[PDB]
Amino acid sequence: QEWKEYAKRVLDEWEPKTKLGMMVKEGQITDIHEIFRRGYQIKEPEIIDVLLPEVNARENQEVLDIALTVRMTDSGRRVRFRVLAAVGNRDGYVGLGIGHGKEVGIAIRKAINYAKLNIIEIKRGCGSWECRCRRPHSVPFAVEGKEGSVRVRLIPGPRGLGLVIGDVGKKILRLAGVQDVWSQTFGETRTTVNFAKAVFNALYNTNRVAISPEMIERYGIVVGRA
């Protein structure tokens, strides 16, 4: 329980500064699902470090893109690094962030922090015609997302079929806990930031579909942790 020990260390050696951090410190909120759907603002990474400690794992942290941007001045070219990264345990929860820095290490650290701040909660299941099982191995139903010019449509896939999507989508879905999916993309997918944000938006939009109580049993819908 190394991650539990890490969570406890973050709990004692930490002084909360926000209302949500105070709630976590005094124990009013004890589960990760309790900080969502209430309108709370997340501004302290210690909240995520305590509730969902697995996000600090090396295998649970992924660096998606590194870009070298240039700004022109009188003297010459000023170089900045933009790093797009994603974090989250491979079960129910995922987050994406962008960090800017003068050096790649600083940019990576800031991107990881912002991803932890931007963590969200998704829903999983099985809605494929060829599987019809009730395990949370895929998206429960077809979902859509978009950012910039990129439009991504995720379709449920049969169990045992790999993530049929680009590499960025593969990494994001693996971090989110999805194992099988089909994809249809339009627009400039070579724009890594837009592609990642579109996949993230689709995973978030999986929460925007109205469902009946029997659909949960039919598709094995699992919200958050399984």
Partner RNA sequence: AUUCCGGUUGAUCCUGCCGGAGGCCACUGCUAUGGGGGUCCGACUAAGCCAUGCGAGUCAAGGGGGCGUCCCUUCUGGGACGCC
User: Please, what is the Cα angle at 55 between 50 and 60, to 5 degrees?
Assistant: 165
Cβ proximity to Zn ion, 59 vs 214, nearer residue: 214
With binding defined as CB under 5 A, does residue 159 bind Zn ion? yes
Q: 75 to 134, contacts with RNA by CB under 7 A?
A: 77
Candidates 18, 113, 118, 192; binder of RNA (CB under 7 A) is 192
Among RNA, Zn ion, none, what binds residue 126 when CB lies within 5 to 8 Å by partner kind? Zn ion
Q: State the binding string over 50-69 for RNA (x if CB under 7 A, else -).
A: -----------------x-x
* Shortest Å, Cβ 87 to RNA: 20
The H helix count followed by the E strand count for the chain is 7, 10
Q: Can you tell me the distance from the alpha carbon of 128 to that of 139, in angstroms, rounded to the nearest whole number?
A: 9
Listed residue (188, 180, 185, 179) closest to 199, CA to CA: 185
SS3 184: strand
Q: Can you tell me the distance from the alpha carbon of 134 to that of 8, in angstroms, rounded to the nearest whole number?
A: 35
Contacts of 18 (CB under 8 A, 6+ apart): 41, 43, 44
SS3 123: strand
Candidates 4, 38, 58, 190; binder of RNA (CB under 7 A) is 190
DSSP 82-99: EEEEEE--SSSEEEEEEE
Q: Can you tell me the distance from the alpha carbon of 154 to that of 185, in angstroms, rounded to the nearest whole number?
A: 9
With binding defined as CB under 5 A, does residue 126 bind Zn ion? yes
With binding defined as CB under 7 A, does residue 194 bind RNA? yes
Q: 160 to 189, contacts with RNA by CB under 7 A?
A: 161-169, 182-185, 187-189
Among RNA, Zn ion, none, what binds residue 131 when CB lies within 5 to 8 Å by partner kind? Zn ion
Contacting positions for Zn ion (CB under 5 A): 126, 131, 133, 159
Contacting positions for RNA (CB under 7 A): 67, 69-72, 77, 148-150, 155, 161-169, 182-185, 187-195
